[PDB]
């Protein structure tokens, strides 16, 4: 019915008016490309050949467009159509008369998409503003869109079958709009959290930690090669840090050339000892933490997720705030290229040798588990004798579960800490966790020491069978193994009952993901619809469409979210 | 033992039988994170391999068969009953977990191009097209014949030379996109000759015809099935996955010279990023590489039953130590470009890698001024129909946030469904307008002078007309 057509989603009101299928759009699988800059995207040749951007013939560009017209659709840098002044369209594929090929001012030649054409790149779902960013086009000879790795974080895209949409603006006006509002370098810093959206990620982060260590010393030829990939190099080789006996540069010395201009920043490495700042060696840090950059030169410190990542006060954020967006784009790209070419010399890996720990560590983990099981047994025996006293506001069952969970969690964390102590400097799990590229201390602990307690719906594994979790266990068994505790690590391998319990926990994880997607989508849409029309007028009042004053100044101080930074007032706290 | 239960009444035959058919192919399942086992169960359904030994006889749509399937070097005991050895899906591949050039970052995978040249992960894609000569029409007969442009008033300019006399292209002829696989003609009632009814190849199939069959179907009408074969060399978009839930596309392909090489000369067929392992906690992948190295050297297929207690990492490591390699499986690698030893020692070992059905050639689409829908006069939908990608409501909200009003206008009006209407000034309702006659008149007012041209999306015109049919009057007044 008419009401049925209009009302539902995919009806005329919403599915055909608010959003609609569009021309000059393309979609294909995305794959990484470290060599491309932040703003560049790699477009396959077929996608570039089908898509055409009409160019008006001017006296300046009549020759170039004439050559494109002569090439035709077959040769790649060609023109699919000619649009005359009258509006007549001459499709060059079917034979055009040699008279028709002649061009005069006012004709519109539809050239094939070429290198440097601005496009808009999108990945569904488009949760935030950074999910549609304008990319320059670089044509490369395979059939996947290729984008730089740093740009993956705004899009929340990884290269495991993902796909993205390519929209080509068709007019100079809209092309300029994209160029000056939505290009990737312009949206490095999000107004949502006044933090940079994009940060060094994956191999480049892990390798930047290793490059910036005090240990790293580079010989002459390696410095040559690293400098070759630095786009903003002045052409002057820095004086080596160790002139004699053999000239040897340092990792920080080369990274100082990457840092843009003169940027001053102080950040702390992840493994910074808390006591260091108070005690001596505060400035001459023993562990080479406390990153300090003065006059755009890395004086000291080991770079990590905190320094080069997506957090307030990062080196990238200070670059965008201070140097500008263009130099910051160059900064991202240069970090990636130089560090990725050093990683060929150094290299990274993950093996079983990382998961395995010392025999003493394994014995300590086992002893912790033994005494934890004994403590849980003692709690159970207290509960059976009714000696246990209920915690205020909780039933005796609830307080028994609380105490048992506390004992098991303490054991789990202690075993994890023992495993983390066992890790050597060379351990690659530790490299990735410390650098912040991937993983967490929890994952290392589960890999090496103890998977942990499996919880479903906020409790230990419930009694699915009559008063017992699985048929193998005895009725009314509240012990650690029966209710889900997985003593073995992933490396050691889960026993069969623990395998089933671990599957139950993982299934809860999967269900939560599936549910959260839908519910959050609905919430986001409602918020947008409620506040879509609100904007800052030229009075700088924030008004809706009706012209009602929502706010007299935006944010009550009339400033935008991206410019602001965290600062300390310093008059507030001190005593009189 | 220390008394737990003395009244057991039944005993399990083997604990690994709790797993199903797809989860049984996972080696060392107990050493993986649970979500990763769940993901491998789904990916294993999509792998390529010989689906059935009678595949030559069968004419199925979308059949993929790998060139050189291999059985796993590290196999579960329960795989024998699933017949996975008989009909394997995947190839054991020397896999190095290393960061080489940054093209294996995220989940992507660097593949050896020389191995790809030697047949590694090469597959065939068979697509069958069916057509039926229907005489059921009163005066319509869909005869099989080669359409002729002069004889048939309805025709298309795609290539018709391939068709033989019967209207069916012979087997062994190459067919590129937009070619006529089957030529069919419907005789046209002469109300007062021919509307073309040929079937055309899906774009970019680029295959060779394998079999052409002519029979009579259930209804008794002549039935023709044509199977088109296309070899599929792996590319830099194809999706490859292991048995432990690690899926990823092919980032780039380096030749054997460029790939890193051990001292023996073995270059990894596949390089996967070390960053995939830790967060996902798929240690089963590492143990399978170790057991594969041991198995390839020893000559016996490794055992990876989930719960064994006789196979430990330490035992595998000692076994490998016997065969002359580092006990944890790491190997000293040399950089292919420069020859210098890589300072870190890379973990190399054979691992069963699978090739999934998702390939970049099937998933690449581009649209520019294509056909439009009838009802909305908007671009079509789908790759088959050359449809444009949808600019959803979330996308328009992002563009609103940008402040790119004109790109939003282009994308939502000018690129999709531009249209012009004539609207009376006195009454907002649209007015009849004869451009060729140059007379524009509005019914209901008897007014001709006051009419204005309005540019609106065709979908908006349709919405306003549907409102008018419900007796709502959307009077759009320019004033």
């Amino acid at each position: 019915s008419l009401k049925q057509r209009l009302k539902g989603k995919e009806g005329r009101v919403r599915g055909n008016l608010m959003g609609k299928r569009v021309d000059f759009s393309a979609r294909t699988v995305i794959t990484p490309d470290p060599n491309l800059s932040i703003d560049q995207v790699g477009v396959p040749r077929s996608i570039a050949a089908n898509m055409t951007f009409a160019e008006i013939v001017t006296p300046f560009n009549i020759d170039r467009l004439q050559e494109l017209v002569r090439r035709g659709n077959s040769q790649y840098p060609g023109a699919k159509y000619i649009i005359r002044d009258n509006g007549d369209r001459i499709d060059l594929r079917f034979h055009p008369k040699p008279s028709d090929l002649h061009l005069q001012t006012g004709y519109k030649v539809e050239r094939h998409m070429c290198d440097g054409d601005i496009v808009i790149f999108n990945r569904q779902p488009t949760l935030h503003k950074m999910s549609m960013m304008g990319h320059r086009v670089r044509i490369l000879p395979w059939s996947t869109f290729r984008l730089n790795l740093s740009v993956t974080t705004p899009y929340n895209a990884d290269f495991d079958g993902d796909e993205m949409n390519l929209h080509l603006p068709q007019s100079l006006e809209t092309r300029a709009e994209i160029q000056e509002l939505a290009m990737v370098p312009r949206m490095i810093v999000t107004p949502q959290s006044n933090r940079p959206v994009m940060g060094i990620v994956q191999d480049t982060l892990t390798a930047v930690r290793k490059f910036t260590k005090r240990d790293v010393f580079l010989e002459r030829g390696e410095v040559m090669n690293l400098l070759m990939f630095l786009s903003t190099w002045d052409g002057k080789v820095p004086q080596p840090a160790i002139l004699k006996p053999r000239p040897l540069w340092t990792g920080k010395q080369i990274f100082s050339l990457i840092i843009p201009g003169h940027i001053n920043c102080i950040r702390t490495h992840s493994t910074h000892p808390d006591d260091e700042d108070s005690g001596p060696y505060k400035h001459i840090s023993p562990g080479d933490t406390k990153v300090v950059v003065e006059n755009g030169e890395l004086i000291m410190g080991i770079l990590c997720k905190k320094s080069l990542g997506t957090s307030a006060g990062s080196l990238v954020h200070i670059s965008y705030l201070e140097m500008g967006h263009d130099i910051t784009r160059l900064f991202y790209s240069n970090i990636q290229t130089v560090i990725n070419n050093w990683l060929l010399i150094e290299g990274h890996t993950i093996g079983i040798g990382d998961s395995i720990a010392d025999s003493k560590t394994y014995q300590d983990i086992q002893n912790t588990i033994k005494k934890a099981k004994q403590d849980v047994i003692e709690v159970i025996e207290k509960a059976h004798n009714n000696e246990l006293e209920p915690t205020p506001g909780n039933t005796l069952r609830q307080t028994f579960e609380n105490q048992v969970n506390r004992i098991l969690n303490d054991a789990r964390d202690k075993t994890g800490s023992s495993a983390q102590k066992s890790l050597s400097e060379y351990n690659n799990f530790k490299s990735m966790v410390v650098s912040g590229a991937k993983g967490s201390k929890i994952n290392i602990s589960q890999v090496i020491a103890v998977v942990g307690q499996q919880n479903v719906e906020g409790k230990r594994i419930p009694f699915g069978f009559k008063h017992r979790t699985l048929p193998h266990f005895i009725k009314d068994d509240y012990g650690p193994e029966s209710r889900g505790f997985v003593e073995n690590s992933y490396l050691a391998g889960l026993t069969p009952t623990e395998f089933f319990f671990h599957a139950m926990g993982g299934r809860e994880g999967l269900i939560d993901t599936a549910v959260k997607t839908a519910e959050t989508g609905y919430i986001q849409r409602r918020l947008i619809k409620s506040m879509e029309s609100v904007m800052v007028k030229y009075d700088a009042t924030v008004r809706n469409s009706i012209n009602q004053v929502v706010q007299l100044r935006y944010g009550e101080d009339g400033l935008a979210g991206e410019s602001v930074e965290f600062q300390n007032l310093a008059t507030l706290k001190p005593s009189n | 033992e220390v008394a737990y239960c003395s009244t057991y009444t039944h005993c399990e035959i083997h604990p690994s039988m709790i797993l199903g058919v797809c989860a049984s192919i996972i080696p060392f399942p107990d050493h993986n994170q649970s979500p990763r086992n769940t993901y491998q169960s789904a990916m294993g359904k999509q792998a390529m391999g010989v689906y059935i030994t009678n595949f030559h006889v069968r004419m199925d749509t979308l059949a993929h068969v790998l060139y050189y399937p291999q059985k796993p070097l590290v196999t579960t005991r329960s795989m024998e009953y699933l017949r996975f050895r008989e009909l394997p899906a995947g190839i054991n591949s020397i896999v190095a977990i290393a960061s080489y050039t940054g093209y294996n970052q995220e989940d992507s995978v660097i593949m050896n191009r020389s191995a790809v040249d030697r047949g590694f992960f090469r597959s065939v894609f068979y697509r069958s097209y069916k057509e039926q000569e229907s005489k059921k029409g009163f005066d319509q007969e869909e005869v099989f014949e080669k359409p002729t442009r002069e004889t048939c008033q309805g025709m298309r300019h795609a290539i018709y030379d391939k068709l033989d006399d019967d209207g069916l292209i012979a087997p062994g002829v190459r067919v590129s996109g937009d070619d006529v696989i089957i030529g069919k003609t419907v005789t046209l009632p002469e109300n007062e000759t021919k509307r073309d009814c040929s079937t055309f190849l899906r774009t970019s199939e680029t295959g060779i015809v394998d079999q052409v069959m002519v029979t009579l179907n259930q209804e008794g009408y002549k039935f023709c099935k044509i199977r088109v074969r296309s070899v599929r060399i792996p590319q830099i978009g194809d999706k490859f996955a292991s048995r432990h839930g690690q899926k990823g596309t092919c980032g780039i392909q380096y030749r054997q010279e460029d790939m890193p090489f051990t001292c023996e000369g073995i270059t990894p067929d596949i390089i996967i990023n070390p960053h995939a392992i830790p967060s996902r906690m798929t240690i089963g992948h590492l143990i399978e590489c170790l057991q594969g190295k041991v198995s390839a050297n020893k000559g016996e297929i490794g055992d990876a039953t989930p719960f064994n207690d006789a196979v430990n990492v330490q035992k595998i490591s000692n076994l490998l130590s016997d065969y002359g390699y580092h006990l944890r499986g790491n190997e000293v690698l040399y950089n292919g470009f420069t020859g210098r030893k890589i300072t870190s020692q890379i973990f190399i070992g054979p691992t069963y890698y699978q090739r999934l059905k998702h390939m970049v050639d099937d998933k690449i689409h581009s649209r520019a001024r294509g056909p439009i829908q009838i009802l909305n006069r908007q671009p079509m939908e789908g790759r088959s129909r050359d449809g444009g990608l949808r600019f959803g409501e979330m996308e328009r909200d992002c563009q609103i946030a940008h402040g790119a009003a004109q790109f939003l206008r282009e994308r939502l009006f000018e690129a999709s469904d531009p249209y012009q209407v004539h609207v009376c000034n006195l009454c907002g309702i649209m007015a009849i307008a004869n451009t060729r006659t140059h007379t524009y008149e509005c019914r209901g007012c008897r007014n001709k002078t006051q009419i204005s041209l309005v540019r609106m999306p065709y979908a908006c015109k349709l919405l306003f007309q549907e409102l008018m049919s419900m007796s709502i009057a959307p009077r759009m007044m320019s004033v």
């Binding site: 969970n405 098991l408 969690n409 789990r412 929890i442 589960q446 998977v451 942990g452 307690q453 499996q454 919880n455 479903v456 906020g458 409790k459 230990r460 997985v486 671990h502 926990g505 993982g506 809860e508 994880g509 939560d512 | 994170q33 649970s34």
Partner: peptide
């Protein structure tokens, strides 16, 4: 899969 306070 870790604990009651962590993740499943």
């Amino acid at each position: 899969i870790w604990g009651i306070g962590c993740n499943p």
